[model samples]
Target chain A: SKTFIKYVSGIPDYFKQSFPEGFTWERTTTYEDGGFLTAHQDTSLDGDCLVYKVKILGNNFPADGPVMQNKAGRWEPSTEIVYEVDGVLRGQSLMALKCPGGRHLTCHLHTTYRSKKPASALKMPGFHFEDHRIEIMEEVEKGKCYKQYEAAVGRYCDAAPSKLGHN
Target chain B: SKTFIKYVSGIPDYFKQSFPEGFTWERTTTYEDGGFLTAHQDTSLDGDCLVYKVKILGNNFPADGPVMQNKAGRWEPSTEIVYEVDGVLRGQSLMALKCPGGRHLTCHLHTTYRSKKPASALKMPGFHFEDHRIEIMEEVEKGKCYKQYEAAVGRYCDAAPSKLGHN
Candidate 1:
């Protein structure tokens, strides 16, 4: 289907809860995997802000993050995907984010990729098997902008797919 | 370009006038031919109506009429066109409209049609050669719904062009 719009109507309540003592909008956490839901920071700027209006940013941006994360029709917690923007893996610090609330806002577009190796075994540049944390560079403005203004992390489904196969 | 959203800023003034005489919102005209400007009826229902909120209907619907009417750019007065919806001529009462104000609201979409013969020298069904009037059937809603709800008169350029080419 064409990348159409979806409205998360029951918006505010979704903000109140997530998992593991729960998360609030805009607070960032280094889950080291796409396992946590984080609200956008803009919600804190204004009282009575509609969560619908807030956008996801950094580690888990709704726009650039894997918008179609749930390939099997359900979102996964530890879904490990190479952090990519327009097909270019951003860095050796490759991990994915779990955009909660309205993550699938642009779910209609799909990024076609295939892998033969177990995703964990797939080799990528710049990784430390020993290091457990991805010290995200703050200046990069990760996950920082309205979902509408940002292009989906993956190319549009209609666009040519990237060579993301893992041997 | 895709039929993207466009804002008619300073919308209220363009509603002020056109040509021959000025027209107000929702004031229907029987110029029979597409020779005058008329506003949607909804504008009058509320005071301080945002013209942006109103929808055009009938002969000059921004939606169904040739949204891409000005193929050459710049609008024309009494430009003759078969009143169509989805490329199907609504009636032998072939004529076009001068959608003043914000008629190009859906101008993003284009309908491909070509005529080698002058438009007036075309053949069609159902017309009055002598009456000099096309009493627009009110039941048929000459100018009716909101512009957004109505489909463009011609087909989307991406879609198959209709057999409108005339020699």
Candidate 2:
């Protein structure tokens, strides 16, 4: 399945009573034709902030861009992929979050990735161990003017998914 | 271009000017991974309805769900695609329409497709291809009764690809 998956740590107490109790994260990505995925971040309200890739045996990512972890802990795209029978990319990421029950925070930063390469593969980048505590980073504004503008006009930005049926 | 290409036809004259012209219906399916489209149909409120499949290598549909043509002059899924992809069997059909003012009517079907045995090659039956126009056979009841059901009520339904980008 190529649909985006969700992984969350510290399951909310309110949710735990109804759901299960666990500091856990899961994964999902839309599995379309040939198991291909366009480069994009897992910006779900809950889940892994880091996307992992597991490349096929015969396939390899373009020399220029494999995948990059941004300073703010987001996965950036490095290549484009064509759907084939076996090639698949698995993404693992933590959730970009907003402060709960307050106006202190605003919208989350969603990073869209594009491929500079012609074709690529989706791989599951394996780590010997799993790490759950991914630190959230502060905002990196494009320019001081934008930052000042952001601070001056402090209106409430709704941190929510646009549609129903989304995790 | 892994994303599905969507086209629409069948509506009032004025709204037709805005979309791609010479737009013939591309009525074929391409199967790879889990992107098997289930049996469904396409129809229009008024006008010559058409559908098109872009970039698919060959006809990719299930064995049981043959192609169907309905009264409205459009093409569509022959039956409910019994196999589901990502837990969705019948994705909403793409629909297009026009108001009294000649603006195009549009909506997404929350489209769903079926699963295949990797044998989802083009198996379009030759006998069913004799100018098969319109792929709906039932009429749906819409209103507060099932406001958000999102299922195509009648024999014909559309995903209205034009509206997919609306949000």
Candidate 3:
């Protein structure tokens, strides 16, 4: 079966018009000084459909704070670091691709908190960001069905210990 | 009318199943070292349908080589810097929002090759990337029409100048 791969340049106006109404912030996971995330793949599905969303509540680490590397059997460094940032918020949606053995290709790998920010900050608080709402849809369509969750903004802070610089 | 804000977590399966089929390469722009992109808005439209797509063919800048900032009226550094990299290939898509005044919110601001990458490197060929296919479509819908475009693997060289240092 020949698969038809279509890529849309931006978010559809339908979804754009829906704003914060269509998104639900589920839970949050934070990282502090020395906090790190290893390379891994994400595969969340709505029954037979592939879906998942991640939002960065706050972060002060350098550019490669949460780096995504390629997994094409290459030992070289990653060239792509998906997700645009606004101050401290980093957001993006990921989906599993149709590959061999259902290969999870939504960012072959990611590190929680890298860069020279955390380890070099002698007395500063650890680096961290809240991964809120790892939600999946009820159907396999866009702008159709999904569960709504709200962000608990009061839950986590990147400078937990209070000595972290406010970059 | 208060803006009803909402967010989506992942790309739909229908879209995933239709890759290399729903996008079109509209234009291409080259960026060498010392090329700086200031903060601005993009408001592109096809009749009453708003559309535009920007793709990075290759990049080798540091963490902030090519950055994307937010325009939510809140003063803060960008939290999102969207780009997928391999050994040297880095690519990502940007789109405008449904904000007032028909203002396009995509790529609020970006640098061609800033942050000392090109200025400091003498004798280097300079850093550059192709922003090709700035295409658009008619109508206002979420998941309806598109024309997919795949990248040519032979288009770019990571450390082209020979002294950029292989990461």
lDDT of 3 by residue, A48-166 (tens): 55443443222111233222221222112122122322111122222232233434333322222111222222222222222222223243554466554323121123345456644
User: Lowest-lDDT window of 10 residues in candidate 1 chain A?
Assistant: A106-115
DockQ of 3: 0.03
The all-Cα superposition gives candidate 3 an RMSD in Å to the true structure of: 20.4
B20-114: candidate 1 lDDT, tens digit per residue: 22222222222331222222322221343332333322222222234324322222211122232322222112233335653332121111112
**DockQ of the candidate models in sequence:** 0.01, 0.03, 0.03
Question: For candidate 2, lDDT tens digit of each residue in B8-115?
Answer: 232112112223322222232322211233333322222554443444332433343222111122222111111123322322222222123322222222333222
TM-scores, each model vs. reference? 0.17, 0.22, 0.20
DockQ winner between 1 and 2, please give it. Answer: 2
Docking class of 1: incorrect
The best candidate in terms of lDDT: 3
Q: How well is each residue in A8-105 modelled by candidate 2, as lDDT tens digits?
A: 23211111221111122222332221122333222122353423343222223223321111122221111111111112221122122112221111
Question: Rank by lDDT, descending?
Answer: 3, 1, 2
What is the CAPRI rating of model 2's predicted complex?
incorrect
Q: Model 3 segments beyond 4 Å from truth?
A: A1-167, B1-86, B91-100, B108-126, B140-167
Each candidate's fnat: 0.00, 0.00, 0.00
Per-prediction backbone clash count: 13, 62, 50
Candidate 2's C-alpha lDDT? 0.21
